Design a protein around this ligand. Structure first.
Ligand code: CA
Ligand code: CA
Ligand code: NA
Length: 1336
């Protein structure tokens, strides 16, 4: 008997309730109760379970079954996640009035308005799921009912609770009322009507191999028979359908077209429900398949896609043959069994049902995705194109429904097609024709199909592949081994298109031609989460359409497939397609705001969007890009931001995308089961926790493992299916920016550790799946039982046979986590090492004999011996070490009676070949006008060095990222290349990224043949805080000593008519310390900032922001939010939406022209938002300048103009905030219709060291009674700059007193000292000036 509670009250004396163990009905519980000495505010009864705690990766999951034992309407229950205290937490729970979320923190505390799901009824049983992630993405469901739309915690709120690991249940009291809930513990230790065929007239259609007995009155199969064996269809007559969810007995006329084909015309009429249609069903046998097809529908009501309709009831919306089993099995038959699959993304809970059809037996009426019935002799499987959904979770994608039906002494289980869809409409407007897809289902019948001398669901599964749908593009999945995100954000152009080609080339070498998948996140507009919906708006700062086309063409040669990250759920005002009609509104007419980051977005009504030309937008992208693109990754879709993102809506989206020739990929793992080939939740193992991963179904994975990356990969933490799956499963990493990750070594290692074998298996189809003994595990706050897979067999078109076997059934054994793989009887993997053949090129084509190869990888040291196949056995054999320079350290191995022994470096890939091989010339950085732009070629030979060439060399950053370094040179060292492929008489920009730790001059110089422009830096003084950038200052990316001061150094120039002798020169003067360079980028640019001219030179400096090459030049982003997707960027005009007045917006996004420099929401941070650095603009020693700009600010004194010098807050004297010269700026709308103008006099410190910038003060903003998105959208918390001008002048005392006057007047309008300033002597000295101004 159990005396041990799974739950206990917390230790805080006053937050204590009463835990008690209670065993009632079948089940055991722990009853949590509140007491008299509790309340619902500071001192509620809190409870706590060992293990239940935010996971290593910062995701909180709760999956709690319970029942409410409180008096009806008297309960206040919920879960606290990431709990710090009563006023610092996230909460999901209910009260009288239903389910809500709520969060509390200094910055922001609110809860859920908007209609709630009703609270649980007393005693009813509740399966609660809650997820809070690292994104701050909160979702919850109760008994598979979504409780609310996804909420994302704001940056401020999430950052504060990021570290909190507490997960508590709350039970609150109020006066006499108490909360009492019983949580379900982990530990818990026939007749029916007979048939009457007397009036039925049957018929038979038959192929060579399959015969089906069919009714002449209604399209139903009585039985099938293959090779004398039988399976029933629908034994009892049911001559009724459901149209628009209404029961209707059709008027049917029948006609047999030929021996294989019969068809029925079916009239459907119900005046009371405005039904008046006819349809033609066709039943056809082909080989061993029965095809059920509605071949024609006619709605006699008048309906026209695109046109509005007066009464949605006149549409023929849904057709249901539910009640007619397409195939079934009888408990009278031997081996009677049904097996089905339902959606599960919980690594602990399989989604599969395995039911013996017996009499007696349990009720069965359930939706399924895949379904099979089998006897001892035959198996059948059913397919349907139904996009029915019975609900969320396991009720979704339920294209089949299985039913128990008692007929006489027999229990039948039959598989029916779920409801079909047809004419649908949104707010009266009928959807486009292409949304309609004629209903269709198929049955396949099979004898043994995997030669194990028994007939079960697996035999159905094998047969099922010839009737099922297949995700468009699925054939490519096998050979995409290296997926990766290349990211751009905030006008920064972190990963230009042509530059991505270098990374493709790099991986090509290190993997010896394995296939790649690069997802361009921020390909459009300014980057990621900018200009959503305008899919055709390829981003100009990363190379425009021209470069994106080049990237696609040249990537083919390396098996690099490209995709783009899009969003069909949300848009920002900047966008072209942004417009009030497309926006989503709540019942009360307020906007459904999306997330606030660069700008505050607004959700869109996807239904409206579909009804109003969304297809046009895909076709524009296609017209713009042309052929070449592989896939489209649709972010967000699934979270209900944009409304209905169900099976039906998702199918329609996928068809739009597919129709352009593109593959479909989604974020959601629940999502797009019918069409997707890639799910981020499945692929990125460390994200969302154990309940948000891939499809946990042996049946589904059996069927489709080779077609998509959608499965449960290896992640020991998550347990269950995730504890070393035998088929592996794609595990993703990256090094080109995503989530601040730019470490290259770990990318390749992971690739061989997990993905090579995962992809090997995808070159075969599963044919046998054998499970072992149930085993007990304990993780993520529970103890649960799990049946692992023990043996999987796969097969090939050419009869090759792979056999994967787990080396132990014992979960405590380490060999539980080990497998052996045999190819045709021969061992290719055992435990930590494998030696796999790989006989396919990057694009999956068969490699020619002479190019066939094997890969070796071993996660430990130690010798391993391998038997060679017959065609390698009597041969020479060469081992190569694979590095970022390709094949290295060639080594002839010794073969000994068909065996070789490898004793090599652990976690290092090697490739074996039958003959000597060489690496090819990569043509690095091609199209970028320079060779090896990022120093990946292992050599500086291409550079003309001048000086002591030993003082320059390529070195690796702390992120394994190659860089040029010059150091310890006692004389000038310089490296020169000629710029290639330039256009005559054309304006250009070039930058090299530079991080200079020496005071010595580090310079970039272009010489056009007609002119020479130069730009230089001394010791760098600005840390790099751009999260998506390779050389930001995170440890894993730091240059050296855990810091990075990398910033782009520019030179602007113009070619003359002769381009044959344009050279670029990086150089460094004498110094001991190091300068590091990386990433030389040269590109067309039409700015003119230097005395109204383009070329770098003397003259007044002006930035109107209209022709910025990249970034926020001459500023660089500061440390105000640490290394981050910085919330300062170039904002784009789209009038009226981005300007004053629209939706109550208080300030302009763009002050003049089409572009301005916008900061969003960074108020009250006490830190530098951005600053100049000397290499972008140098305030020269002793000279005085007049800095001038126009600006908008939505609150008084939230942002300030600052003059500083040296490295800000570097711990050196006077680099502190106090010591900056600071000018707080007032708001620009309360008393003005346009941006105000600022003027400052700045004199360069003698250390050549000075800079100016914008600082976020400690003052609070003033949102004028607004809040939420309204507050964000309207710019109370924003700051915009435009029309910068810096101009050298002659400092004089008078000059100072005049500028002071202008700066002190605004105070005077709400004195005598200031009047006296205005009549200061024309020749006041700078001293007396400062004297007087100080006294004001
Ligand atoms: Ca079999
Ligand atoms: Ca402008
Ligand atoms: Na923007």
């Amino acid at each position: 008997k159990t005396v041990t509670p799974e739950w206990q009250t917390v230790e805080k004396k006053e937050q204590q309730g009463t835990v008690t163990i209670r065993e009632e009905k079948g089940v055991r519980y722990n009853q949590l109760s509140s007491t008299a000495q509790n309340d619902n505010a500071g001192k509620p009864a809190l409870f706590e379970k060992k293990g239940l705690t935010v996971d290593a990766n910062g995701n909180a999951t709760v999956d709690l079954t319970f029942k409410d034992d409180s008096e009806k309407g008297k309960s206040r229950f919920g879960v606290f996640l990431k709990f710090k205290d009563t006023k610092n937490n996230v909460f999901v729970g209910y009260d009288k009035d239903g389910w809500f979320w709520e969060y509390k923190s200094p910055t922001t505390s609110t809860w859920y308005r908007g209609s709630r799901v009703a609270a649980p009824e007393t005693g009813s049983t509740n399966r609660l799921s809650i997820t809070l992630k690292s994104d701050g993405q909160l979702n919850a469901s109760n008994n598979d009912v979504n409780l609310f739309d996804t909420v994302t915690l704001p940056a401020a709120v999430n950052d504060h609770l990021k570290n909190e690991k507490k997960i508590l249940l709350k039970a609150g009291s109020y006066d006499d009322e108490r909360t009492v809930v019983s949580v379900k513990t982990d530990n818990q230790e026939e007749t029916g009507p007979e048939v009457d065929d007397s009036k039925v007239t049957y018929d038979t259609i038959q192929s060579k191999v399959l015969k089906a007995v069919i009714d002449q009155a209604f399209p139903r199969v009585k039985e099938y028979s293959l090779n004398g064996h039988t399976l029933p269809g629908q034994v009892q007559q049911f001559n009724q359908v459901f149209i628009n969810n209404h029961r209707i007995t059709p008027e049917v006329t029948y006609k047999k077209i030929n021996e294989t084909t019969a068809e029925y015309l079916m009239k459907l009429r119900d005046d009371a429900h405005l039904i008046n249609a006819e349809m033609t069903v066709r039943l056809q046998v082909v080989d061993n398949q029965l095809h059920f097809d509605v071949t024609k529908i006619v709605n006699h009501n008048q309906v026209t896609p695109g046109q509005k309709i007066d009464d949605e009831r006149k549409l023929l919306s849904s057709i249901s043959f539910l009640g007619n089993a397409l195939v079934s099995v009888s408990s009278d038959q031997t081996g009677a069994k049904f097996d089905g699959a339902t959606m599960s993304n919980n690594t602990h809970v399989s989604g599969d049902d395995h039911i013996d059809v017996t009499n007696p037996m349990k009720d069965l009426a359930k939706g399924y995705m895949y379904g099979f019935v089998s006897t001892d002799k035959l198996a059948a499987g059913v397919w349907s194109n139904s996009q029915n959904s019975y609900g969320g979770g396991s009720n979704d994608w339920t294209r089949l429904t299985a039913y128990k039906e008692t007929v006489g002494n027999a229990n039948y289980v039959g598989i029916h097609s779920s409801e079909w869809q047809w004419e649908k409409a949104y707010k009266g407007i009928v959807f486009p024709e292409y949304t309609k897809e004629l209903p269709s289902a198929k049955v396949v019948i099979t004898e043994d199909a995997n030669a194990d001398k028994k007939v079960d669901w697996q035999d159905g599964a094998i047969a099922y592949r010839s009737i099922m749908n297949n995700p468009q593009g699925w054939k490519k999945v096998k050979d995409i081994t290296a997926y990766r995100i290349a990211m751009n954000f905030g006008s920064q152009a972190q990963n230009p298109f042509l530059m991505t080609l270098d990374g493709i080339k790099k991986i090509n070498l290190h993997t010896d031609g394995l296939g790649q998948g690069v997802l361009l996140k921020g390909y459009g507009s300014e980057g990621h989460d900018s200009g959503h919906l305008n899919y055709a708006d390829i981003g100009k700062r990363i190379g425009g359409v021209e470069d994106f086309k080049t990237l696609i063409e040249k990537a083919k040669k390396y098996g690099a497939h490209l995709g783009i990250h899009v969003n069909a759920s949300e848009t920002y005002p900047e966008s072209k397609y942004f417009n009030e009609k497309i926006l989503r509104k709540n019942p009360d007419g307020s906007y459904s705001y999306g997330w606030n980051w660069l700008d505050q977005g607004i959700n869109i009504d996807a239904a409206y969007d579909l009804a109003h030309g969304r297809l046009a937008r895909w076709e524009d992208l296609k017209k713009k890009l042309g052929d070449g693109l592989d896939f489209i990754y649709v972010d967000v879709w699934g979270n209900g931001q944009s409304g209905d993102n169900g099976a039906w809506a998702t199918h329609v989206l996928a068809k739009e995308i597919n129709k352009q020739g593109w593959r479909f990929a989604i974020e959601w793992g629940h999502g797009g089961e019918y069409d997707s080939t890639f799910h981020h939740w499945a692929a990125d193992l460390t994200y969302g926790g154990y309940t948000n991963k891939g499809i946990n179904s042996a049946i589904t994975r059996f069927i489709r493992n080779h077609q998509k990356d959608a499965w449960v990969g290896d992640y020991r933490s998550y347990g269950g299916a995730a504890n070393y799956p035998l088929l592996g499963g794609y595990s993703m990493k990256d090094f080109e920016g995503w989530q601040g990750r730019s470490d290259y070594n770990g990318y390749v290692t992971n690739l061989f550790a997990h993905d090579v074998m995962t992809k090997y298996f995808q070159h075969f189809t599963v044919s046998k799946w054998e499970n072992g003994t149930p085993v007990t595990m304990t993780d993520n706050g529970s103890t649960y039982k799990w049946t692992p897979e023990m043996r999987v067999e796969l097969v090939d078109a050419d009869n090759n046979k792979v056999v994967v076997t787990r080396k132990s059934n014992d979960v405590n054994s380490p060999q539980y986590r080990e497998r052996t793989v045999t190819l045709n009887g021969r061992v290719i993997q055992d435990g930590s090492a494998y030696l796999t053949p790989w006989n396919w090129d990057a694009n999956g084509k068969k490699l020619s004999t002479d190019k066939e190869k094997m890969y070796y990888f071993n996660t430990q040291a130690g010798a391993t011996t391998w038997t060679l196949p017959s065609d390698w056995a009597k041969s020479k054999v060469y081992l190569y070490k694979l590095t970022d320079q390709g094949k290295t350290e060639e080594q002839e191995l010794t073969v000994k009676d068909g065996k070789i022994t490898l004793d090599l470096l652990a976690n290092q890939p090697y490739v074996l070949y039958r003959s000597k091989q060489t690496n090819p010339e990569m043509s690095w950085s091609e199209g970028m006008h320079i060779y090896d732009q990022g120093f990946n070629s292992g050599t500086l030979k291409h550079w003309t060095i001048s000086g002591d060439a030993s003082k320059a060399e390529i070195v690796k950053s702390q992120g394994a990222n190659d860089m040029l370094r010059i150091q310890g040179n006692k004389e000038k060292v310089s490296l020169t290349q000629k710029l290639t492929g330039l256009k005559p008489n054309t304006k250009y920009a070039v930058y090299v990224g530079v991080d200079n730790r020496s005071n010595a001059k580090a310079s970039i110089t272009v010489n056009t043949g007609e002119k020479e422009v130069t730009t230089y830096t001394n010791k760098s003084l600005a840390l790099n805080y751009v999260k998506a950038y390779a050389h930001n200052t995170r440890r894993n990316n730091a240059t050296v000593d855990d810091t990075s001061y990398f910033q782009n150094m520019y030179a602007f120039f113009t070619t003359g008519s002769d381009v044959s002798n344009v050279t670029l020169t990086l150089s460094r003067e004498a110094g001991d310390e190091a300068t590091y360079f990386d990433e030389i980028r040269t590109f067309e640019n039409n700015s003119s900032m230097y005395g109204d001219k383009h070329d770098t030179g003397k003259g007044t400096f002006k930035q109107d922001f209209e022709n910025v090459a990249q970034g926020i030049f001459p500023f660089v982003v500061g440390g105000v939010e640490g290394v981050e997707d910085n919330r300062t960027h170039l904002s784009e005009k789209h009038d009226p939406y981005t300007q004053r007045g629209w939706n109550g917006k208080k300030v302009d996004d763009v002050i003049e022209g089409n572009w301005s420099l916008k900061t969003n929401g960074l108020v009250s941070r006490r830190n530098l938002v951005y600053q100049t650095i000397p290499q972008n603009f140098r305030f020269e020693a002793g000279k005085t300048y007049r800095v001038t700009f126009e600006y908008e600010a939505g609150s008084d004194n939230t942002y300030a103009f600052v003059v500083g010098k040296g490295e800000f807050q570097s711990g050196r004297r006077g680099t502190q905030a106090s010591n900056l010269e600071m000018h707080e700026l007032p708001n620009t709308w309360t008393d003005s219709k346009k941006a105000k103008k600022a003027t400052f006099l700045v004199t360069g410190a003698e250390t050549g060291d000075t800079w100016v910038g914008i600082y976020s003060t400690g003052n609070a903003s003033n949102t004028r009674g607004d809040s939420g998105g309204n507050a964000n959208f309207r710019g109370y918390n924003d700051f915009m700059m435009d029309n910068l001008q810096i101009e050298e002048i002659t400092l004089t005392g008078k000059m100072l007193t005049e500028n002071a006057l202008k700066n002190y007047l605004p105070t005077v309008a709400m004195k005598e000292a200031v009047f006296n300033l205005s009549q200061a002597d024309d020749d006041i000295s700078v001293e007396e000036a400062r004297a007087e101004i100080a006294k004001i």
